[PDB]
Amino acid sequence: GPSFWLGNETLKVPLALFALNRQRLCERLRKNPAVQAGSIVVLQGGEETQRYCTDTGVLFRQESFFHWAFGVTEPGCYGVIDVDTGKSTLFVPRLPASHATWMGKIHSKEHFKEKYAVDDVQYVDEIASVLTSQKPSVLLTLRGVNTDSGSVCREASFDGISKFEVNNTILHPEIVECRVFKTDMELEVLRYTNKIFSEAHREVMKAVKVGMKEYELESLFEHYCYSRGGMRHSSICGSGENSAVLHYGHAGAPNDRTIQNGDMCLFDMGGEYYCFASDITCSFPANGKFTADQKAVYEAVLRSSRAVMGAMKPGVWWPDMHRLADRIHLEELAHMGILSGSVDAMVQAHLGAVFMPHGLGHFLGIDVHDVGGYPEGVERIDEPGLRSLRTARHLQPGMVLTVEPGIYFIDHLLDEALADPARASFLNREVLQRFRGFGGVRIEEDVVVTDSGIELLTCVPRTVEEIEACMAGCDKAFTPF
Amino acid sequence: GPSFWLGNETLKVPLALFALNRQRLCERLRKNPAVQAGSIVVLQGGEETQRYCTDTGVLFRQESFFHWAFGVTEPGCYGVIDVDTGKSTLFVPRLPASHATWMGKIHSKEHFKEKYAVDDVQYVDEIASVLTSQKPSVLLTLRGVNTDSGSVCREASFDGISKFEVNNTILHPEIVECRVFKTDMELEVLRYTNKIFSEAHREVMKAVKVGMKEYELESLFEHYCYSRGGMRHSCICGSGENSAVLHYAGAPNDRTIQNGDMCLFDMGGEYYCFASDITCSFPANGKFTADQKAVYEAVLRSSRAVMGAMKPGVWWPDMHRLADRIHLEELAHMGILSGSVDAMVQAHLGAVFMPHGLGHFLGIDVHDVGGYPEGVERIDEPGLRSLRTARHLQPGMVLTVEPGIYFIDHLLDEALADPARASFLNREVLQRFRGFGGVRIEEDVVVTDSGIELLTCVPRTVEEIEACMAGCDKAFTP
């Protein structure tokens, strides 16, 4: 069957991946007792956009649910699936003659049918007529709340849809649940995105020199992933104190610090291949040699990383892993002399959240922060740190998670803790003072839950010895200029 | 005063640039009979956006009119200018404490005042109260039609604005006209963007090898511009027949470059929201064939004829027609066409080979504002109707000059089926050029008192291009 491919050494992704997803969605819907026979799932693809009132185009990236179901890269499409038969129909725009001059060849419907391995292709302007001829009981459309953004999914609409019976409640939780569990075909893509990002991280570690701007390394990473991996979307490079800023690198903070001798670097890179994401973070000394303090903090996060990975298997409650990481960080910070006292009491006082204010990790898939973390019946825990978890679910096979503990020295959180007598007694101010401005360390792996444990997708140097050896290497193997 | 800078060898852009723009806008408004005392210009900045319903952020880029006036990179701002005094006030978001954890330091209002060299800074939620205290006669907001997209500019609005007198007709044509004429400070940025893009084009010409994918060169170009130029925002990379596809869209150009192909690399991007757009064409294998030399030198001739003719007072559509005539003459000189060139022009044959406009205003947007102000009409003829301006040239305008010749099957076939055009085409020679793709040579220029200032600096002659691709230093002169 056909595949998506960007040539060279990039991955061939079979269009069968999307056919399987369509089948899985139908199977799940057929089991839902509220679903009427003759129902048709209706999804609307993304459209091309421009910057404000200008004609400057914005890079088109397909909407994630639509991509999951169809793998279609073209703007302006819709896609429908007959629930009872699984039959798929793609609707493509009927394009003007002038498209041939400006945009490219005008493909036939048959070309798209072959390309996407769908059962039928029609033009978008005929969607009402085509759906009418099929005499559906109900159109199932997508509407629900994303629990990371709080946004409501945009429901499909077309001229004449008001003449149909439309349900916008059933679909969302079902398609979300399908997305939560990755098929073997999806896992092949995620292994590939991890391979490329892992190689690109190694290249950054080999290339970093004191005196460079953070964005110079961002640029190199993106160049590797695009030119060698076909990862066009490679869109957090934080040195020194910036490593404590959790989403550093936005327009408010555009990666323009000069990397200095003595800095810790935290390079968190997210990107995608054919709308399949990966998200990997490496931390390393800018000058290639960990100091004693850097080694201590780094190895504390290595410890929690590997303890969590070693504990993960089906039935494990993700908030328990978050609390495990907190406890280990507190133990290690006490060994370093930053903290003193009973670690049990530190945990009761939520001291771990002072050093790791974000969630331990999140579902990963078509979105970097993937859907389904908080389905109905799964509640967010209203405690420091835990409230930032992007899922409070128990692990099951096929889930793909980031595992991303970190320790940071964040002045406003440290200062709050020092003002609070329940927490201040644990903090040794004179030792802590030396770590003001340290920034932070985060170690982020992508893993898949298996029947008995996990499969680690990421492959980057991780021990102090491995990282120092990587950075000291002479073989960059790719020098642009 | 303060400047924007990305360190290393990147350009320091003084915030004084934006102060000058504010002053020029106020001076223009004061001469406008529709403008009364006590007026305040009110602009709303862009906000951060996300991908569909996800929390995936889209890289924030400031709205162009707001950038032109204020140079502000942060999302969520507003900006106002008292017309009578020129006094500027920037409104910035009042941030949540958690911003400090996730996004970075929460800067004081004083920090922003110093950073942007404005007269006052306030929080966005205080805008109604602050403007009420100034007792303005009228708020002048932005509303108008962009003549390239057809979109209507987004007018500022805030909670409480309905208690003010608002006019949304006066500002747009005036701020557009200010943008049309570049200041010396703006030209310094456009010289820089052209320098970086020109260097990146040279690197692509040096690196390109048969067998590469088009997107490998796109990637290399972007890497140069970002790592060496700080140009984070960068892109038609068309090999073989793809060079005839004018906007070949935002996805990887994934054709394998083949021996004998012509390449057309059209790159547009920006530094601190100031654009450049440069197109270079060259043979993939580094050696022009005779046919490739002929088509290429035809576009080189039109490029240079237009650049030599441009000066204040010239009507831009006349330059488009000059390019068409030169293309037709040269296509006849290579045997593709025969007959009278005067007759070919009368039949609009030039548009078969160049269906797009000769060139466009450039500035904060690649297709910059102000091409078709009130009274300036689009010419309803093939080719000319695609011009993005029909204005007369005046000093301070920045234009692209981008003639091209393409072999586009559906246009050639229309001409062959049209008795008014068919007899000019020699099928026996033309057949050799089917699938050739095309050549475009795009320079960025400033209109000056004496003619033009060429901003772009890339190899252009056949010999210069072959020398570049063979790895010669820039200083080498064939």
Ligand code: PRO
């Ligand atoms: O947003 C999140 O959940 C992770 C933790 C900080 C960086 N990315």
Ligand code: PRO
């Ligand atoms: O859009 C335009 O006006 C020019 C001509 C083709 C490429 N850019």
Ligand SMILES: [Cl-]
């Ligand atoms: Cl022919």
Ligand SMILES: [Mn+2]
């Ligand atoms: Mn990350």
Ligand SMILES: [Mn+2]
């Ligand atoms: Mn992550």
Ligand SMILES: [Mn+2]
């Ligand atoms: Mn261009």
Ligand SMILES: [Mn+2]
């Ligand atoms: Mn252009």
Ligand code: NA
């Ligand atoms: Na190194």
Ligand code: NA
């Ligand atoms: Na203490």
Ligand SMILES: [O-]
């Ligand atoms: O992350």
Ligand SMILES: [O-]
């Ligand atoms: O262009």
